[PDB]
């Protein structure tokens, strides 16, 4: 019966502290407006561990379902982005997208070289990614392999392996397929049924600061 | 080509990937100009391990000596900046400056609360900092304590404990006092004696991009 408000926001590029600010800002607006859900169209090659963990925590504290949607086609939620997905209420992926490839490294060196992460950091992230998978009823076996084998999956593979809940071409198909689904983690201690009958979709613009920071990045 | 040139550049703020680019740009200019040395006036309260390791490496491969100068008074080379200092050909400190407090961390929570990393990663950075100090003939006992005790030192303490080589109030005093000193690490396979008699000092201005990006990180 009731008209259900759903926010859609875009989050792109490397996961850093500005990204946390984006997640925080977009989720707050949606909580304040009593939204049914917020969908985040995520496209990230990776990023920083602390900002990622802050983002997962912000999503756990969210008073509304946060749906991570790997979109548009060609996008990925690789590295830090996979933890964000796994830490969210529902994951969707568009055709031609990617998820996984999470083997921690200390970082990239001068000439194509990479700085190896010590076994402790690796084990620490295996425990954390397995825990996010277990908490959200997702495939912990496969999530470990995102690390131990730098495994990356197509949307169809991700669904089949029990890592994501939805494969969808656009917001339309996403709302239709996810309508009636229960969130994979609780919202304020209860597993919520998503009501996407009678929905109004609202798109959230990035702010000045968002646009500036990312235009400096594109250069 | 019958000149003796010392370049001076400025590096201020968080050590990030962008800080690597500045170090690379300035050192490259000095190399291409066959400078006797480059002095880097360093003021940094923190930064990222990966960028720091890349900067130490770039300094190790430098074809000219790199002198890290903690300047102006009130500056610090804390956290990532101490590693950079310890990785370089010579360290000078201005009166009222600070070196140390190098504990590795995973970063900061939503609170701004401290997220310490696993014990074994502390041990990894202890090893790394001990290596840098021993490779440059500097006190690895005090260097370890930069981490294990969060130890921070004044210039005079740093000199007495055999962590730095010079205390100087300005570039001119720095040149006078470091003249005839041997680099603490090699330059192209050889420890080199600094020749600062009759030197031309050339200041490299930070670019608009440097200042803008620094100022944005700052907040």
């Amino acid at each position: 019966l009731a008209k259900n408000i759903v926010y859609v926001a875009q989050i792109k590029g490397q996961i850093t502290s500005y990204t946390y600010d984006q997640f925080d800002r977009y989720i707050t607006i949606a909580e304040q407006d009593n939204a049914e859900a917020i969908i985040i169209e995520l496209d990230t090659p990776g990023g920083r561990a602390d900002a990622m963990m802050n983002i997962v925590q912000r999503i756990q504290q969210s008073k509304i379902p946060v749906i991570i949607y790997v979109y548009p086609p060609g996008a990925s939620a690789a590295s830090a982005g996979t933890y964000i997905a796994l830490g969210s209420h529902l994951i969707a992926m568009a055709p031609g997208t990617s998820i996984g490839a999470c083997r921690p490294i200390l970082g990239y060196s001068q000439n194509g070289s990479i700085i190896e992460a010590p076994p402790a950091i690796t084990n620490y992230f295996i425990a954390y990614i397995k825990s996010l998978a277990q908490e959200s009823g997702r495939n912990a076996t496969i999530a470990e392999e995102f690390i131990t084998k730098d495994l990356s999956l197509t949307p169809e593979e991700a669904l089949k392996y029990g890592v994501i809940e939805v494969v969808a071409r656009d917001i339309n198909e996403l709302l239709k397929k996810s309508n009636g689904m229960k969130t994979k983690i609780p919202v304020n201690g209860r597993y919520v049924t998503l009501n996407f009958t009678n929905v109004e979709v609202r798109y959230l613009a990035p702010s000045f600061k968002d646009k500036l920071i990312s235009y400096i990045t594109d250069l | 080509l019958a000149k003796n040139i010392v370049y001076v550049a400025q590096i201020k703020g968080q050590i990030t990937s962008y800080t690597y680019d500045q170090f690379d740009r300035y050192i490259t200019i000095a190399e291409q100009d066959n400078a006797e040395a480059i002095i880097i006036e360093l003021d940094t309260p923190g930064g990222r391990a990966d960028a720091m390791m890349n900067i130490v490496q770039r300094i190790q491969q430098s074809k000219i000596p790199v002198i890290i100068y903690v300047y102006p008074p009130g500056a610090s080379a804390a956290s990532a900046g101490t590693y950079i200092a310890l990785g370089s050909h010579l360290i000078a400190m201005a009166p009222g400056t600070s070196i140390g407090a190098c504990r590795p961390i995973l970063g900061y929570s939503q609170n701004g609360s401290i997220i310490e990393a696993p014990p074994a990663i502390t041990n990894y950075f202890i090893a790394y900092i001990k290596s840098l100090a021993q490779e440059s003939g500097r006190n690895a006992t005090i260097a370890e304590e930069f981490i294990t005790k969060d130890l921070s030192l004044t210039p005079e303490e740093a000199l007495k404990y055999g962590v730095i080589e010079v205390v100087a109030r300005d570039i001119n005093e720095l040149l006078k006092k470091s003249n005839g000193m041997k680099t603490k690490i090699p330059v192209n396979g050889r420890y080199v004696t600094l020749n600062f008699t009759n030197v031309e000092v050339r200041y490299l201005a930070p670019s608009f991009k440097d200042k803008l990006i620094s100022y944005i990180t700052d907040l």
């Binding site: 990776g46 990023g47 920083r48 561990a49 602390d50 690789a78 590295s79 830090a80 490839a101 999470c102 083997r103 921690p104 490294i105 200390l106 970082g107 990239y108 990479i114 992460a117 950091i121 992230f125 730098d150 | 923190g46 930064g47 990222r48 391990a49 990966d50 720091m52 804390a78 956290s79 990532a80 590693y83 407090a101 190098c102 504990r103 590795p104 961390i105 995973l106 970063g107 990393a117 990663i121 950075f125």
Partner: peptide, 8 residues
Amino acid sequence: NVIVLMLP
């Protein structure tokens, strides 16, 4: 306080 990590 050097901040340590990222993933690929």
